[PDB]
Coordinates of C-alpha atoms in Angstrom, one line a residue:
Chain A
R1 CA 36.4 -37.9 21.5
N2 CA 32.7 -38.8 21.3
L3 CA 33.0 -41.3 24.2
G4 CA 35.0 -39.2 26.7
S5 CA 33.5 -37.9 30.0
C6 CA 34.6 -36.6 33.4
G7 CA 33.7 -36.9 37.0
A8 CA 30.2 -35.7 37.7
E9 CA 31.4 -33.3 40.3
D10 CA 33.4 -31.9 37.4
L11 CA 30.2 -31.7 35.2
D12 CA 27.7 -30.0 37.6
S13 CA 30.0 -27.0 37.3
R14 CA 29.7 -26.4 33.6
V15 CA 28.4 -23.0 32.5
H16 CA 24.8 -21.7 32.7
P17 CA 22.6 -23.3 30.0
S18 CA 21.1 -20.0 28.9
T19 CA 23.1 -19.8 25.7
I20 CA 25.0 -16.5 25.3
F21 CA 24.2 -12.8 25.1
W22 CA 26.7 -12.4 22.3
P23 CA 24.8 -12.7 19.0
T24 CA 25.9 -11.1 15.8
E25 CA 23.9 -8.0 14.6
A26 CA 21.8 -8.9 11.6
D27 CA 19.8 -6.1 9.9
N28 CA 17.7 -8.4 7.8
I29 CA 17.1 -12.1 7.1
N30 CA 19.5 -12.1 4.2
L31 CA 22.5 -12.5 6.5
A32 CA 22.0 -16.0 8.0
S33 CA 19.6 -18.4 9.6
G34 CA 21.5 -19.3 12.8
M35 CA 37.4 -30.0 11.0
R36 CA 37.9 -26.2 10.8
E37 CA 34.2 -25.7 11.4
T38 CA 34.8 -26.6 15.0
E39 CA 36.6 -23.2 15.5
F40 CA 36.4 -21.2 12.3
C41 CA 34.3 -18.4 13.9
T42 CA 33.3 -19.7 17.3
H43 CA 34.2 -16.3 18.7
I44 CA 30.6 -15.0 18.6
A45 CA 30.4 -11.3 19.1
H46 CA 28.8 -8.2 17.8
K47 CA 29.9 -7.1 14.3
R48 CA 27.5 -4.3 13.5
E49 CA 28.8 -2.4 10.5
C50 CA 27.8 0.3 8.1
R51 CA 25.2 -1.1 5.8
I52 CA 26.8 1.1 3.1
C53 CA 30.6 0.8 3.4
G54 CA 31.0 -2.1 5.8
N55 CA 33.1 -0.5 8.5
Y56 CA 33.0 -1.2 12.2
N57 CA 34.1 2.3 13.4
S58 CA 31.9 5.3 14.1
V59 CA 28.5 3.6 13.4
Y60 CA 25.3 5.5 14.4
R61 CA 23.1 2.9 16.0
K62 CA 20.7 5.7 17.0
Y63 CA 17.2 5.2 15.5
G64 CA 18.4 1.9 14.1
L65 CA 20.4 3.3 11.2
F66 CA 23.8 1.6 11.4
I67 CA 25.4 4.1 9.0
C68 CA 28.9 5.4 9.3
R69 CA 29.3 9.1 9.7
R70 CA 31.4 9.6 6.6
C71 CA 29.1 7.4 4.6
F72 CA 26.2 9.5 5.8
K73 CA 26.7 13.2 4.8
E74 CA 26.6 12.0 1.2
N75 CA 23.2 10.2 1.4
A76 CA 21.5 12.5 4.0
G77 CA 19.7 14.3 1.2
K78 CA 18.4 11.2 -0.3
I79 CA 17.2 9.8 3.1
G80 CA 15.5 13.1 4.0
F81 CA 17.8 14.8 6.5
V82 CA 18.2 18.5 5.6
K83 CA 20.8 21.0 6.9
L84 CA 18.9 24.0 8.3
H85 CA 19.2 26.1 11.4
Chain B
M1 CA -21.6 -2.0 10.1
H2 CA -19.9 -0.1 13.0
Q3 CA -16.3 -0.7 14.0
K4 CA -14.6 2.4 15.4
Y5 CA -11.8 3.1 12.9
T6 CA -8.7 5.1 13.0
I7 CA -6.6 6.8 10.2
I8 CA -2.9 7.5 10.6
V9 CA -0.9 9.8 8.3
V10 CA 2.9 10.3 8.3
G11 CA 5.1 12.5 6.3
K12 CA 8.3 14.6 6.2
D13 CA 7.0 17.5 4.2
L14 CA 4.5 19.9 5.6
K15 CA 2.8 20.8 2.3
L16 CA 1.5 17.5 1.1
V17 CA 0.5 16.5 4.6
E18 CA -1.5 19.7 4.7
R19 CA -2.9 18.9 1.2
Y20 CA -3.9 15.3 1.7
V21 CA -5.8 16.6 4.8
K22 CA -8.0 19.0 2.9
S23 CA -9.0 16.5 0.3
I24 CA -9.8 13.7 2.7
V25 CA -11.9 16.0 5.0
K26 CA -13.7 17.5 2.1
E27 CA -14.5 14.0 0.9
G28 CA -15.7 12.8 4.3
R29 CA -18.1 15.5 5.3
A30 CA -21.0 13.2 4.5
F31 CA -19.8 10.1 6.3
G32 CA -19.4 12.0 9.5
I33 CA -15.6 12.2 9.8
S34 CA -14.2 15.3 11.6
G35 CA -10.9 17.2 11.6
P36 CA -7.5 16.0 12.8
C37 CA -5.5 16.0 16.0
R38 CA -2.2 17.5 15.0
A39 CA 0.3 15.6 17.1
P40 CA 3.6 16.7 18.6
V41 CA 6.4 17.0 16.0
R42 CA 9.0 14.3 16.2
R43 CA 12.5 15.8 15.9
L44 CA 15.3 13.6 14.7
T45 CA 18.7 15.2 15.3
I46 CA 22.2 14.3 14.3
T47 CA 25.4 16.3 14.9
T48 CA 28.4 15.1 12.9
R49 CA 31.9 16.5 12.3
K50 CA 32.0 18.4 9.0
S51 CA 35.3 16.7 8.1
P52 CA 36.2 13.1 7.3
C53 CA 39.2 13.6 9.7
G54 CA 40.3 15.7 12.6
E55 CA 41.8 18.9 11.2
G56 CA 41.5 22.6 11.5
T57 CA 38.8 24.2 13.5
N58 CA 36.2 21.8 14.9
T59 CA 33.0 22.5 12.8
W60 CA 29.8 20.5 13.2
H61 CA 26.9 19.7 10.9
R62 CA 23.4 19.7 12.4
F63 CA 21.0 17.5 10.4
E64 CA 17.4 16.9 11.4
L65 CA 14.3 15.1 10.2
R66 CA 10.8 16.4 11.1
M67 CA 7.9 13.9 10.9
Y68 CA 4.4 15.2 10.9
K69 CA 1.4 13.2 12.0
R70 CA -2.4 13.7 11.5
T71 CA -4.9 11.3 12.9
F72 CA -8.5 11.0 11.9
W73 CA -10.4 8.3 13.8
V74 CA -13.8 9.9 13.5
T75 CA -15.2 7.4 10.9
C76 CA -16.2 4.6 13.2
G77 CA -19.9 3.8 12.9
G78 CA -20.3 6.4 10.1
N79 CA -18.3 4.2 7.8
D80 CA -18.5 0.4 7.2
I81 CA -15.7 -1.9 6.0
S82 CA -16.5 -1.4 2.3
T83 CA -17.2 2.3 2.6
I84 CA -13.7 3.0 3.9
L85 CA -12.3 2.3 0.4
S86 CA -14.7 4.9 -1.0
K87 CA -12.7 7.5 1.0
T88 CA -9.2 6.2 0.3
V89 CA -9.6 6.4 -3.5
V90 CA -11.2 9.8 -4.4
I91 CA -8.3 11.5 -2.5
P92 CA -5.3 12.5 -4.5
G93 CA -2.7 9.8 -3.8
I94 CA 0.7 11.2 -3.3
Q95 CA 3.9 9.3 -3.9
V96 CA 5.0 9.6 -0.3
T97 CA 2.5 9.8 2.5
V98 CA 1.9 6.5 4.2
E99 CA -1.7 6.2 5.6
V100 CA -2.5 3.3 7.9
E101 CA -6.0 2.3 9.1
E102 CA -6.9 0.3 12.2
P103 CA -10.2 -0.1 14.2
Chain C
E1 CA 50.5 -35.9 6.8
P2 CA 49.7 -39.7 6.8
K3 CA 49.5 -41.2 3.4
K4 CA 47.0 -43.8 2.2
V5 CA 47.4 -47.6 1.9
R6 CA 46.8 -49.2 -1.5
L7 CA 43.4 -50.7 -2.1
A8 CA 43.0 -54.3 -3.2
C9 CA 40.7 -57.3 -3.1
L10 CA 39.8 -57.2 0.6
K11 CA 36.4 -58.6 -0.3
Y12 CA 38.1 -62.0 -0.6
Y13 CA 37.1 -62.2 3.1
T14 CA 34.9 -65.0 1.8
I15 CA 36.3 -67.8 -0.3
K16 CA 33.4 -67.8 -2.7
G17 CA 30.9 -65.1 -1.9
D18 CA 30.0 -66.4 1.5
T19 CA 28.8 -62.9 2.4
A20 CA 30.7 -62.5 5.7
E21 CA 31.5 -58.8 6.4
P22 CA 29.2 -56.4 4.6
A23 CA 41.0 -54.3 12.3
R24 CA 42.4 -53.5 15.8
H25 CA 39.8 -52.0 18.1
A26 CA 36.2 -52.8 17.0
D27 CA 35.2 -49.6 15.3
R28 CA 32.3 -49.0 13.0
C29 CA 33.0 -47.9 9.4
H30 CA 33.4 -44.3 10.5
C31 CA 32.3 -43.3 14.0
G32 CA 32.5 -46.4 16.2
Chain D
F1 CA 21.8 -48.1 -29.3
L2 CA 21.7 -47.3 -25.5
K3 CA 23.6 -44.0 -25.5
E4 CA 21.1 -41.2 -24.6
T5 CA 19.2 -42.0 -21.4
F6 CA 22.3 -42.7 -19.4
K7 CA 23.2 -39.0 -20.2
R8 CA 19.7 -38.1 -19.0
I9 CA 20.4 -40.2 -15.9
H10 CA 23.8 -38.6 -15.4
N11 CA 22.5 -35.1 -15.2
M12 CA 20.7 -36.6 -12.2
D13 CA 23.3 -39.3 -11.9
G14 CA 22.7 -43.0 -11.0
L15 CA 25.7 -44.7 -12.4
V16 CA 28.8 -45.3 -10.4
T17 CA 32.4 -46.4 -10.9
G18 CA 35.2 -48.1 -8.9
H19 CA 35.2 -51.3 -6.9
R20 CA 34.3 -49.9 -3.5
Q21 CA 31.2 -48.1 -4.8
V22 CA 29.7 -51.0 -6.6
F23 CA 29.9 -53.4 -3.7
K24 CA 28.4 -50.9 -1.4
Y25 CA 25.9 -50.5 -4.2
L26 CA 25.6 -54.2 -4.7
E27 CA 24.7 -54.8 -1.0
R28 CA 22.4 -52.4 0.8
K29 CA 21.5 -50.6 -2.4
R30 CA 18.9 -50.8 -5.1
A31 CA 21.0 -52.5 -7.7
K32 CA 18.8 -52.8 -10.8
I33 CA 21.4 -54.0 -13.2
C34 CA 24.8 -53.0 -14.5
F35 CA 26.7 -53.4 -17.7
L36 CA 30.0 -54.8 -16.6
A37 CA 33.5 -54.1 -17.9
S38 CA 33.4 -57.7 -19.0
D39 CA 36.2 -59.4 -17.1
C40 CA 39.0 -56.9 -17.7
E41 CA 41.7 -56.6 -15.0
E42 CA 40.6 -59.9 -13.6
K43 CA 37.6 -62.2 -14.0
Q44 CA 37.7 -62.9 -10.3
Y45 CA 37.6 -59.2 -9.8
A46 CA 34.2 -59.5 -11.5
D47 CA 33.5 -63.0 -10.4
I48 CA 33.0 -61.4 -7.0
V49 CA 30.2 -59.5 -8.8
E50 CA 28.7 -62.3 -10.8
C51 CA 28.8 -64.7 -7.8
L52 CA 27.0 -62.3 -5.6
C53 CA 24.6 -61.2 -8.2
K54 CA 23.6 -64.8 -9.0
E55 CA 23.7 -65.4 -5.2
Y56 CA 22.0 -62.1 -4.6
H57 CA 19.7 -58.7 -11.6
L58 CA 22.4 -57.8 -14.2
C59 CA 24.2 -59.1 -17.3
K60 CA 27.4 -58.5 -19.3
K61 CA 28.5 -56.8 -22.5
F62 CA 31.9 -56.0 -24.0
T63 CA 31.9 -52.2 -24.2
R64 CA 34.0 -50.6 -21.4
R65 CA 34.9 -47.4 -23.3
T66 CA 31.3 -46.7 -24.0
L67 CA 30.7 -47.3 -20.3
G68 CA 33.0 -44.3 -20.0
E69 CA 31.1 -42.5 -22.7
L70 CA 27.5 -42.5 -21.4
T71 CA 29.3 -42.1 -18.0
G72 CA 30.4 -38.5 -17.8
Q73 CA 33.8 -39.8 -16.8
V74 CA 35.7 -38.4 -19.8
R75 CA 36.9 -34.9 -20.3
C76 CA 34.4 -33.3 -22.6
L77 CA 35.3 -29.8 -23.8
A78 CA 32.5 -27.2 -24.4
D79 CA 32.5 -28.0 -28.1
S80 CA 31.0 -31.5 -27.2
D81 CA 34.0 -33.4 -28.7
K82 CA 36.3 -36.0 -27.4
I83 CA 39.5 -34.8 -25.6
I84 CA 41.0 -37.3 -23.2
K85 CA 40.9 -41.1 -23.5
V86 CA 37.5 -42.4 -22.6
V87 CA 38.1 -43.5 -19.0
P88 CA 37.3 -47.2 -18.7
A89 CA 35.0 -48.1 -15.8
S90 CA 33.4 -51.2 -14.5
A91 CA 31.4 -50.6 -11.4
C92 CA 28.5 -50.1 -13.8
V93 CA 25.7 -50.1 -11.2
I94 CA 22.5 -48.1 -11.7
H95 CA 20.4 -46.7 -8.8
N96 CA 17.7 -44.1 -9.4
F97 CA 17.3 -45.5 -12.9
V98 CA 15.0 -42.6 -13.8
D99 CA 16.3 -50.7 -21.7
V100 CA 12.5 -50.9 -21.9
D101 CA 13.2 -50.1 -25.5
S102 CA 15.7 -53.0 -25.4
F103 CA 13.4 -55.3 -23.6
Chain E
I1 CA -2.1 10.2 28.8
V2 CA -0.7 8.3 25.8
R3 CA 2.1 5.8 25.2
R4 CA 5.0 6.9 23.1
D5 CA 6.2 3.4 22.4
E6 CA 3.4 2.7 19.9
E7 CA 3.6 5.7 17.5
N8 CA 7.3 4.8 17.4
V9 CA 6.2 1.8 15.4
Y10 CA 4.8 4.0 12.6
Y11 CA 7.8 6.4 12.8
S12 CA 10.3 3.5 12.5
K13 CA 8.1 2.1 9.7
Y14 CA 8.6 5.3 7.7
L15 CA 12.3 5.5 8.3
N16 CA 12.9 2.0 6.9
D17 CA 11.4 2.7 3.5
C18 CA 13.4 5.9 3.1
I19 CA 16.6 3.9 3.4
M20 CA 15.0 1.4 1.0
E21 CA 14.6 4.2 -1.5
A22 CA 18.2 5.3 -1.5
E23 CA 19.8 1.8 -2.1
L24 CA 17.6 1.5 -5.1
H25 CA 18.8 4.9 -6.4
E26 CA 22.4 3.8 -6.1
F27 CA 21.7 0.5 -7.8
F28 CA 19.9 2.2 -10.7
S29 CA 22.6 4.9 -11.1
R30 CA 25.1 2.0 -11.4
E31 CA 23.0 0.0 -13.8
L32 CA 20.5 2.0 -15.9
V33 CA 23.0 4.5 -17.3
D34 CA 22.2 3.5 -20.8
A35 CA 18.6 4.5 -20.3
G36 CA 19.6 7.9 -18.9
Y37 CA 18.3 7.2 -15.4
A38 CA 17.6 10.4 -13.5
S39 CA 15.9 9.5 -10.2
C40 CA 13.4 7.2 -8.5
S41 CA 10.4 7.6 -6.4
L42 CA 8.3 5.1 -4.5
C43 CA 4.7 4.9 -3.3
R44 CA 4.6 2.3 -0.6
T45 CA 1.1 0.8 -0.9
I46 CA -0.4 -1.6 1.6
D47 CA -1.1 -4.0 -1.2
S48 CA 2.2 -4.0 -3.2
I49 CA 4.9 -1.6 -4.3
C50 CA 4.7 0.9 -7.2
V51 CA 7.9 2.5 -8.3
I52 CA 8.0 5.4 -10.7
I53 CA 11.2 5.8 -12.6
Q54 CA 12.6 8.8 -14.5
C55 CA 14.5 7.9 -17.6
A56 CA 15.2 9.9 -20.8
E57 CA 14.0 7.0 -23.0
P58 CA 12.3 4.2 -21.0
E59 CA 11.9 2.0 -24.1
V60 CA 15.5 0.9 -23.7
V61 CA 15.2 -0.2 -20.1
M62 CA 11.6 -1.2 -20.9
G63 CA 12.9 -4.0 -23.0
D64 CA 11.4 -6.1 -25.8
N65 CA 8.3 -7.9 -24.4
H66 CA 9.2 -6.0 -21.1
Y67 CA 11.6 -8.9 -20.4
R68 CA 14.5 -6.9 -18.9
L69 CA 12.1 -4.9 -16.6
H70 CA 10.3 -8.1 -15.5
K71 CA 13.6 -9.7 -14.7
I72 CA 14.4 -6.6 -12.6
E73 CA 11.2 -6.9 -10.6
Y74 CA 11.8 -10.4 -9.5
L75 CA 15.3 -9.5 -8.4
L76 CA 14.2 -6.8 -6.0
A77 CA 11.7 -9.3 -4.5
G78 CA 14.6 -11.4 -3.2
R79 CA 16.4 -8.6 -1.5
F80 CA 13.5 -6.9 0.2
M81 CA 11.7 -10.2 1.1
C82 CA 8.7 -8.9 -0.8
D83 CA 6.7 -11.3 -2.9
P84 CA 7.3 -10.8 -6.7
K85 CA 4.4 -9.5 -8.8
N86 CA 3.8 -7.0 -6.0
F87 CA 6.8 -4.9 -7.1
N88 CA 5.3 -3.2 -10.1
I89 CA 7.6 -0.7 -11.7
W90 CA 6.3 2.2 -13.8
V91 CA 8.5 4.1 -16.1
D92 CA 8.2 7.8 -16.9
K93 CA 10.0 10.0 -19.4
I94 CA 11.7 13.4 -19.3
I95 CA 11.3 16.0 -22.0
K96 CA 13.5 19.0 -21.1
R97 CA 16.7 17.1 -20.6
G98 CA 18.7 20.3 -20.8
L99 CA 16.9 21.3 -17.6
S100 CA 18.4 18.3 -15.8
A101 CA 22.1 18.1 -14.9
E102 CA 22.3 14.4 -14.4
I103 CA 21.6 13.5 -18.0
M104 CA 24.1 16.0 -19.3
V105 CA 26.8 14.8 -17.0
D106 CA 26.2 11.2 -18.0
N107 CA 26.5 12.3 -21.6
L108 CA 29.7 14.2 -20.8
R109 CA 31.3 11.2 -19.2
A110 CA 30.3 9.1 -22.2
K111 CA 32.0 11.5 -24.5
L112 CA 35.1 11.8 -22.4
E113 CA 35.7 8.1 -22.2
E114 CA 35.9 8.1 -26.0
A115 CA 39.0 10.3 -25.6
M116 CA 36.9 13.2 -26.9
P117 CA 38.5 16.6 -26.1
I118 CA 37.2 18.2 -22.9
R119 CA 36.6 21.7 -24.3
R120 CA 34.4 20.6 -27.2
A121 CA 32.3 18.3 -25.1
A122 CA 31.7 20.8 -22.3
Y123 CA 30.7 23.5 -24.7
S124 CA 28.4 21.1 -26.6
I125 CA 26.7 20.4 -23.2
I126 CA 26.4 24.1 -22.5
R127 CA 24.9 25.1 -25.9
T128 CA 22.5 22.2 -25.4
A129 CA 21.4 23.6 -22.1
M130 CA 21.0 27.1 -23.4
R131 CA 19.0 25.8 -26.4
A132 CA 16.6 24.0 -24.0
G133 CA 16.2 27.2 -22.2
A134 CA 18.6 28.2 -19.4
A135 CA 19.9 31.3 -17.7
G136 CA 23.2 29.7 -17.0
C137 CA 25.4 26.6 -16.8
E138 CA 28.8 25.9 -15.3
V139 CA 31.1 23.0 -15.9
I140 CA 34.3 21.8 -14.3
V141 CA 37.1 19.3 -14.9
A142 CA 39.8 18.5 -12.3
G143 CA 42.4 15.8 -12.5
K144 CA 45.6 14.8 -14.3
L145 CA 44.5 16.1 -17.7
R146 CA 47.9 16.3 -19.4
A147 CA 50.9 16.4 -17.1
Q148 CA 51.7 14.8 -13.7
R149 CA 51.0 18.1 -12.0
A150 CA 47.2 18.5 -11.6
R151 CA 45.2 21.6 -12.2
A152 CA 41.5 22.4 -12.9
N153 CA 39.9 24.5 -15.5
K154 CA 36.2 25.6 -15.5
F155 CA 33.9 26.7 -18.4
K156 CA 30.7 28.6 -18.2
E157 CA 28.4 31.2 -19.8
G158 CA 25.8 33.1 -17.9
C159 CA 25.1 34.0 -14.3
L160 CA 24.8 31.3 -11.6
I161 CA 23.7 32.0 -8.0
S162 CA 25.5 30.2 -5.1
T163 CA 24.0 31.5 -1.9
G164 CA 20.8 31.5 0.1
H165 CA 17.8 29.2 0.2
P166 CA 17.1 29.7 -3.6
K167 CA 20.2 27.6 -4.2
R168 CA 18.1 24.7 -2.8
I169 CA 15.6 24.8 -5.7
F170 CA 16.6 26.7 -8.9
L171 CA 20.1 25.4 -8.8
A172 CA 20.6 21.7 -9.6
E173 CA 24.1 20.3 -9.2
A174 CA 25.6 16.9 -10.1
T175 CA 29.0 15.2 -10.2
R176 CA 30.7 12.0 -11.3
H177 CA 34.1 10.3 -11.2
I178 CA 35.9 8.9 -14.2
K179 CA 38.6 6.2 -13.9
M180 CA 41.1 6.7 -16.7
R181 CA 44.6 5.5 -17.3
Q182 CA 46.5 8.4 -15.6
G183 CA 44.0 8.6 -12.8
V184 CA 40.7 9.7 -11.5
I185 CA 39.2 12.6 -13.5
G186 CA 36.6 14.6 -11.6
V187 CA 33.7 16.4 -13.3
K188 CA 30.8 18.4 -11.9
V189 CA 27.9 20.4 -13.4
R190 CA 25.3 22.9 -12.3
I191 CA 22.4 24.5 -14.2
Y192 CA 20.4 27.6 -13.1
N193 CA 16.8 28.0 -14.1
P194 CA 14.8 30.7 -12.4
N195 CA 11.4 30.0 -14.1
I196 CA 11.0 26.4 -13.2
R197 CA 7.4 25.5 -12.0
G198 CA 6.4 29.1 -12.2
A199 CA 8.3 30.0 -9.0
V200 CA 9.6 33.6 -8.7
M201 CA 13.0 34.4 -7.3
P202 CA 12.9 37.0 -4.6
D203 CA 14.8 40.4 -4.9
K204 CA 12.7 40.6 -8.1
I205 CA 10.3 43.4 -8.8
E206 CA 7.9 44.0 -11.7
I207 CA 6.0 47.3 -12.2
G208 CA 3.2 48.2 -14.6
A209 CA 2.5 51.7 -15.9
Chain F
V1 CA 34.8 -26.5 -1.7
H2 CA 33.3 -30.0 -1.5
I3 CA 29.9 -28.7 -2.7
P4 CA 27.3 -31.4 -3.3
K5 CA 25.4 -31.7 -6.6
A6 CA 22.1 -31.0 -4.8
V7 CA 23.3 -27.4 -4.0
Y8 CA 24.2 -27.0 -7.7
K9 CA 20.8 -28.0 -8.9
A10 CA 19.0 -25.9 -6.3
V11 CA 20.9 -22.8 -7.2
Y12 CA 20.4 -23.3 -10.9
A13 CA 16.7 -23.9 -10.5
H14 CA 16.2 -20.8 -8.4
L15 CA 18.2 -18.9 -11.0
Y16 CA 15.9 -20.1 -13.8
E17 CA 12.7 -19.4 -11.9
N18 CA 13.7 -15.9 -10.9
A19 CA 16.5 -15.3 -13.5
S20 CA 18.2 -13.5 -10.6
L21 CA 20.2 -13.8 -7.3
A22 CA 20.2 -10.9 -4.9
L23 CA 23.0 -12.2 -2.7
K24 CA 24.9 -10.8 0.3
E25 CA 28.6 -10.0 0.7
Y26 CA 29.2 -12.3 3.6
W27 CA 32.1 -14.6 4.5
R28 CA 31.4 -16.0 8.0
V29 CA 29.4 -19.1 8.6
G30 CA 25.7 -18.9 7.9
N31 CA 22.8 -20.2 5.9
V32 CA 21.0 -18.5 3.0
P33 CA 17.3 -18.1 3.9
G34 CA 16.0 -18.3 0.3
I35 CA 17.1 -21.3 -1.7
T36 CA 16.6 -24.6 0.0
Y37 CA 17.0 -28.3 -0.8
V38 CA 15.9 -31.6 0.6
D39 CA 18.4 -34.4 -0.1
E40 CA 20.3 -36.7 2.2
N41 CA 19.4 -34.2 4.9
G42 CA 15.9 -35.5 4.5
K43 CA 14.2 -32.1 4.8
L44 CA 14.3 -28.8 3.0
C45 CA 17.6 -27.4 4.3
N46 CA 19.3 -24.2 3.5
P47 CA 22.9 -24.1 2.1
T48 CA 26.0 -22.3 3.4
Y49 CA 27.3 -19.0 2.1
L50 CA 30.8 -20.2 1.2
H51 CA 29.5 -22.8 -1.3
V52 CA 27.1 -20.5 -3.1
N53 CA 29.6 -17.7 -3.2
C54 CA 32.1 -20.0 -4.9
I55 CA 29.5 -21.2 -7.3
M56 CA 28.4 -17.8 -8.3
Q57 CA 32.0 -16.7 -8.7
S58 CA 32.6 -19.5 -11.1
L59 CA 29.4 -18.6 -13.0
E60 CA 30.4 -14.9 -13.4
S61 CA 33.9 -15.7 -14.3
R62 CA 32.5 -17.9 -17.1
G63 CA 30.2 -15.2 -18.4
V64 CA 26.9 -16.9 -17.5
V65 CA 25.8 -14.1 -15.2
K66 CA 26.9 -10.6 -14.5
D67 CA 27.0 -8.7 -11.2
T68 CA 26.2 -5.1 -10.2
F69 CA 27.5 -4.4 -6.7
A70 CA 25.9 -1.4 -5.0
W71 CA 26.1 -1.3 -1.2
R72 CA 26.6 -4.6 0.6
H73 CA 24.6 -6.9 -1.8
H74 CA 25.6 -8.7 -4.9
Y75 CA 23.0 -8.5 -7.7
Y76 CA 23.5 -11.1 -10.4
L77 CA 21.6 -11.5 -13.7
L78 CA 21.8 -14.2 -16.3
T79 CA 22.2 -13.6 -20.0
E80 CA 21.1 -15.4 -23.2
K81 CA 24.1 -17.7 -23.0
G82 CA 23.3 -18.6 -19.4
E83 CA 19.7 -19.4 -20.4
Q84 CA 21.2 -21.6 -23.1
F85 CA 23.3 -23.4 -20.4
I86 CA 21.2 -23.7 -17.3
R87 CA 18.7 -25.3 -19.7
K88 CA 21.1 -28.1 -20.4
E89 CA 21.9 -29.2 -16.8
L90 CA 18.3 -29.2 -15.5
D91 CA 17.2 -31.6 -18.4
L92 CA 15.2 -28.8 -19.9
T93 CA 14.2 -28.3 -23.6
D94 CA 14.4 -25.2 -25.7
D95 CA 10.7 -24.4 -25.6
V96 CA 10.6 -24.0 -21.8
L97 CA 11.4 -20.4 -20.8
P98 CA 12.0 -18.6 -17.5
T99 CA 9.1 -17.3 -15.6
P100 CA 9.7 -13.5 -16.0
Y101 CA 9.4 -13.9 -19.7
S102 CA 5.7 -14.2 -19.1
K103 CA 3.9 -11.5 -17.1
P104 CA 4.7 -11.3 -13.4
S105 CA 1.0 -10.4 -13.2

């Protein structure tokens, strides 16, 4: 299909070149650098997940943590958060 | 020679941050450094449900993190590039009290 | 689920090593 | 002799088997030499090689099984002992090359 | 008068290293259990990293020719994108192990996985603590000890305080989980020492005549 | 699953040089930023997570290395046996030793 092409009036209407505003959330560099490969994971979307227990529900993005709430009360003492007042 | 330098200090405990200070200022009397500017306290706050699930009365946790900051920038001409190290060594290094320097 | 075709002495393209080819539509070894 | 370096080659490879590989290694490839299977299945099978070689670096020797020995083309258990039948080969070609003791 | 978006750099630069600390703590607790790992502390230097460990006997983790430890240093270089040789690790030793709950609970789990009886092990831990100098120690075991029905029994000796701010210092607690055939067996420990670091508990009055 | 030999050699060499592998628990499509190789591609290219994950799984199942999961990262370490193996593939000899044997300093 490397030689196919369509009417130019059907090619000026392709999408905006400015890539996409749907990149995956990567905390560090260790995640990535950026046949079935044609569609294995083309659905590019956010996947931010607890950096402890790897869960996509109830993640505190505030202050750039990305820590679930249940995976947080345990480690709060280690991190530095203290329960006073 | 003269560079106009700044010292930043950060910490989560009030005791060490008040102990590092005394040592550094006592050490710098000669070079011309002066006291700090105690900055507004940064309050991190998190409210979380006390339970891993929705049950019983709705009870909340209230965690917080205080961060304290003291800034000496009064070295400047009184201290040259090499002489700065003289002041960052005699002090009693503490395991957790990041101190950054920038002219 | 197409299944291969047996390989054989297709190099006999030349009677005696005349070095000819180093077929339907003219396609390159792989792409075109 | 000639039984140790091939192994050193094989860890980085350089030998090849099968008819398609050799010819594609005969033409448009740095064919140094190859120790043939010595006219096994058909001489013309290999007369295609000799004719092209003399028309366009190698020699011959009767030792196909050894060709499968130095070639890591036989199932070798961790104990470093023979298991399966030493797989006869013939494509023989050598590429990276990296003998002199023989010549 | 000032811009709040700059100091946020320093603040976010002190939050990142705290999270770095805890992951290491979990990793150690999961690996250096044979060295009696207690805790970890970190002095982020501008030049490198210096890490001060707390083990009952560092010589084990220290390794012949310091091979194991040096292996470890390189490993943490990969994960934190730090250059190796800048990740120096210093070991430190603990003396009054009875004063620390973590070591004793690790010992207790070790004993229990041998099929050693619970009562004997717990009371050995307790007399250990009182020998090292302790005003109290409490131990617990909950799970499917014998029958399908699950019940918990607790051992102890002397007084233990469980209220106030003093519980945040003189009272050290610890826990673990044990995966056995019948199912998870849960154990937890707490030791009370009022004379640590020469700190005086309140509601305490001394008079001289 | 059709992993080229170049990836094998690159992985093994990084293993030997750092005796380690602090890998990530990832299964999508992506490239490892550390180990890199230059073959056929013509320039130092990174490899893909699937290939390396399969390789390390084989290694561990064979006893060469051992893991120590903690949060979201795999931490592998090689043993004496592994040292006596990696040495064979990379054309090494007994005398050569891994870098951490010496001083990091």
